[model samples]
Target: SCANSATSRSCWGEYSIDTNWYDVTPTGVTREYWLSVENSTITPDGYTRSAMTFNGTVPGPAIIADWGDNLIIHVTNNLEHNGTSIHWHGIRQLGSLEYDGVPGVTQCPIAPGDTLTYKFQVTQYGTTWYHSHFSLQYGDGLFGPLIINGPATADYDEDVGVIFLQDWAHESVFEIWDTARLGAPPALENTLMNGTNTFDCSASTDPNCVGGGKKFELTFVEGTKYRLRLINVGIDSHFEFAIDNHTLTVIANDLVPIVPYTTDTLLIGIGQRYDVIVEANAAADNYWIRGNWGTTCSTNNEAANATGILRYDSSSIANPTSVGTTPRGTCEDEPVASLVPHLALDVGGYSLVDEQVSSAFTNYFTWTINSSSLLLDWSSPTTLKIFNNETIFPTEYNVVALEQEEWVVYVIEDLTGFGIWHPIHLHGHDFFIVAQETDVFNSDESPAKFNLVNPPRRDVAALPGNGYLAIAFKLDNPGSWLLHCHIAWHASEGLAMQFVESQSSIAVKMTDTAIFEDTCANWNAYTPTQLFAEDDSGI
Candidate 1:
């Protein structure tokens, strides 16, 4: 048995921190879990509303396992009218692309009353999430935390689990999605810290304002260090998280363990995560855990109320009287230089450099990349096309084919000049942040700024408004991968693209075809009998 303590966090069983995860095989452990997706009405933040949930919770059950374990997840969609699918965010489905869980790109949505069993090996460790990828369902509370226990870059006495920062609305996101299609996203009503917060019921007389919500509180002991896995699961908010009067030692970002660094506040974009260790060294009193909603990036009607309580003594129930250090309102990602990977790997030369321009069609408020917008058909996925030996992709599908097993670089420049940032997320692989800047990208000059030596690598990073972001990833994962904006509205409005990497190997890598074909067949049969209206991008 492995002995893990405050001093020996980097050791696990027979493996140590020096183990190369990329080459090591699993230890023959399998973890199984079941998720029942159903509809329920509940008051999350003193306001009652209809929500789609997993197992009757806002943020569903935690799926915990070891680093080298195989995950067998059985998901049953029990919704009355909606079909759903769960995407394991930040999990590299290596050769198992059939389980990547994109509704229209990887596989069809799990139809109502249908069960889909997703099997994948855990190739990496750290904190991540699982959420619905069907339209805007996740915004209506369809998400859960996934923790892969493994070696850490820093030593800590205890684990605090996952802390989720999300912008909650009293009304369902689908109700206000029209505003996003016509112009900008409608403002959200409240904010949530781990699915609970107080709403000012006095400000409104609506009977649904139950006014019984409470803050997410954490207890601490004097001089004990706790590991807090911070995840930003919001639809459009960029959070600057801080614990009053306490310094945070950040050890990891996304799923990649990085060289430990210290900071007072952490800027977390949508779909991004940061793992920090906080020591309970403050005076024996309660303190505030602030999630500073960035106004420069997005808006919430009640931005001032995103907070939680951190108590030193569990017996005391008094509120915190502490203040945050400084207010940071920028939407850009944390500096790339600050997030250094612990096991440094220099980027290799790319065989292709694709420069994509991001723009918007103001008439319909639809976003596009290089004059094209993605609109996938849920019944006929890209993987299904490859399985059937088809090659032609529709123009609106926004498919980019990469046939080589070499490096590929993407320079995404935002020319929309809308001053709206995007937290771009990629499925199936973590790309190296080659270059990120707030200035317009020059084809000749930007390459000079590329950090080819041990650059920061993660699954998600922010692309500055009217600027550019350059990322590089090897085409080793054979799959139909989707790269899109993490903003729920933006993604629904067609701000996405697909990379069919190593087209020749996709079908070869997919060993089984029965479940994949069965899922699509079920969705095809279910759609004809009902009003399956897909108004947005079918991702």
Candidate 2:
């Protein structure tokens, strides 16, 4: 349990609250969900095309649980061609690396006729999601919301649901993913909120285009507060999310409660999550909710139209008379000053020391950490290698076998001058954002910027196109965890690496060895006739 970061013996002491939550187990609640993967079709926005979907829908099923509950998911792949796996985004899979669901890292990909059941306890509570970790599949159509119920810092009358700001493509992800290598990505057709939006299909070029695409509308009761969880599920675009004439009371950032702050707009990068409370105090009318690809980045197709509707219960709301503020031309995140973690933590709690590491490489095309882009062999998975007591990991995989039970401080900088901002994600730990510097990163001007008190503690943070995003975490969870950019293209081109934490701790936590050996045996037996190609990083 998160109450004990490591085992009960060696761990962070005294979680500052009413009590030791880990020691007390409430009535156990178990939640089960079954997901089937199929190559189906989705007509989001009235454009019909072939899509790799889940259960014949644009968005898949929702997995909900309580704070001290168990989540059991049985995923069956019915697809005739490709294999698949789902990674629980932003989840601290502490001590359970096998359920992490990375195809080659944790276990082999679930083959065509195979089914993999993931069982893990939910220790942390917040808004997060699950998506296909297999190459570019989630972008095509294999993702959904995962909600863990808990107390909110800000109160609301109703919890409406998830609001996804996504970029849509007519073609499959297999078609346009490689364009990132050319330094120019394909222009996405349109953007959507909750799988609905309108595009001028008649004015366009494609054959199957439909003119009558519609926008998703939300109806709110007057004088009531609603919790709307905002998710940036786009493939490559950074979004500025805002609702005209509405002030959003920001409560949480990426599953962590923050002291509520008010803002008119929220800038969210790919794989980021925000839970904000909106009050329906405005005069009954229609207000527009927009997610824009701001024009700061040269590579993004800067979508001109990305919107939906925020309507009152008594309004027809067919057309909103609302107008938005002048769009900020820069594709950047909101200022960090406004975001203060609700839980005050001191750096002395972890007894950590700051160490600077950077994204560096000999080749511009291929990205890396500390001068090497990670490359792994599918035949021998990393976890399996560890299970065999294999001490030395290959250098090309860019593995950092951290000294056991030590506090690790990784200060990450984007050395590339290409001016493309990246949202980075780390697995197996919910880290503290102690310090960050943007635009220009100088080693001499670092420690003075550290936020020791009330820093935003989260699993993911924004790394500006030029500078750095630094974080600190305890090595209590002994496993090989991923630290990579959320950009599929960037990571696929080798902008990723792993941390092999304490082997003794990880080994003791692992209970089933036969499952790992069995999965590998099946993958090897099918290898001669089947092939799972590496289009992106085989994450």
Candidate 3:
């Protein structure tokens, strides 16, 4: 529990805090974690900077738990300023809203010098994460890797925590608004891995920022199967990631296990996570793991920001080995097997998508493909007329029309396509990631090669680099849902939309207006919205 001082109180103190690992099994066969939030310093690059963290790291230590186990988190806020809480992203609480962690919704924020005890039973298992739901401080550094080992039947390898990415700004992300307001460059330029600034490496003065100047260096063993838990906590950046000399086999996305798919590189957008199994190659040389901007945003003239690296240590030899060139591939490649038949069988069971076309709710939304424009505004009074005669509403379930029974499509227009890949999170259910296309989709290719069975479940999906990514989810949840890009800026620039289903009797019983008000009230205070007005023109 959080008490004001470590030495001053019992487990029920108001402000004192402590964190320790707990043995969940009676004889200690399994282990769980009890996290305590406190003000601490993470010396990235040997600099003792202040951060509100768990176990004193930005992405806190990886916690291993098991499905169906009761996980108890005792959260105590010791900071002098804001209150704090933790949200278990993608974990269904089994209707336990108190452990949901939305401040003032489930429970009030753990006030300064106050303590809160959260208890929840883990039902699903995969690569998941936990972070502060209080503010964008999550983007600042208050997150950690949460891995839940499934039943013994689950497949795969040694779980490795690859939770590292770059976030913009250290001197108060609050300052970014003023810069964006003034049309100036962002406060922070380079992205970092595990919070180390790029280009800040010294020849010898700093040990953390050693060789290669401010890039995070990682070493891996050859011939071992490793599961990488990749989480992107950035507020704006979407990363196109690649590791030299290794092929990443994606076993899961956003904590949902799937039929393993292999790719030369994986695309991870902000707020998304992927669990990929990488078998190290025998080519003994340092290989660089790089993440850059997707093709959508870069016009043939723009430069992209470089984040993170993987430096494979070479084996000792009489003759030096030559390093191989980095591989080039899209984040949207199909899995090693066919997924078309699986899509029909898996999604066919869900009634939401099946009856979606015939439902009373019909919505029309306008989109643009390059310079072409669709005159649609949220505040306008005219109902958006659809060429297909569909009705569109901000709070309604509108099916995104698919071209074929097994084929889903996303038409990426100029604005949505030419920006950072938004980590579009679908709440309550996971979906089958069908295909991705740039400019236009090609259907003549072999459709039988995609993996249909056991497709991954994820809360967030990264839109492809240049065009559109086709993903299908079973809308199993019965409430207002959020579908928005994870990028803070683009979301602020009208990239956010929502879908609601008031059909459930349980949903109807809940106060819809009250929940909507609560959600609006919990909106991030430091978000770009509060900084720039609608007519400000300085976004």
* Model 3: residues with Cα > 4 Å off, grouped in runs: 1-32, 46-48, 103-108, 151-157, 181-187, 195-198, 201-215, 293-345, 349-420, 432-457, 463-475, 478-481, 490-539
Per-residue lDDT over 257-356 for candidate 2, one digit per residue giving the tens place of the 0 to 100 score:
7888998888887788889989989988888887766656423332766888888854584778788866675656666787777766544433333222
Q: Higher-lDDT candidate among 1 and 2?
A: 1
Report the lDDT tens digits of candidate 1 across residue range 306-376: 89999999888798999788967678788898999887877787854554655566547788887887888
Worst 10 residues of 2 by lDDT: 4-13
Give Cα-based local distance difference scores for all models. 0.87, 0.72, 0.47
Error of 3 at 387 (Å): 40
lDDT of 3 by residue, 232-341 (tens): 67656546566666777765566554545667666676767777777766475665566654444322111233544554553322222234345343444333242222
Clashes of 2: 1
By summed lDDT, the worst window of 10 consecutive residues in model 3 runs over 354-363
Better of 2 and 3 by lDDT: 2
Please list the residue runs of candidate 1 whose C-alpha ends up more than 4 Å from where it truly belongs after superposition: 1-3, 507-511
Question: Which order, best to worst by TM-score?
Answer: 1, 2, 3
At residue 336, candidate 3 shows an lDDT of 21
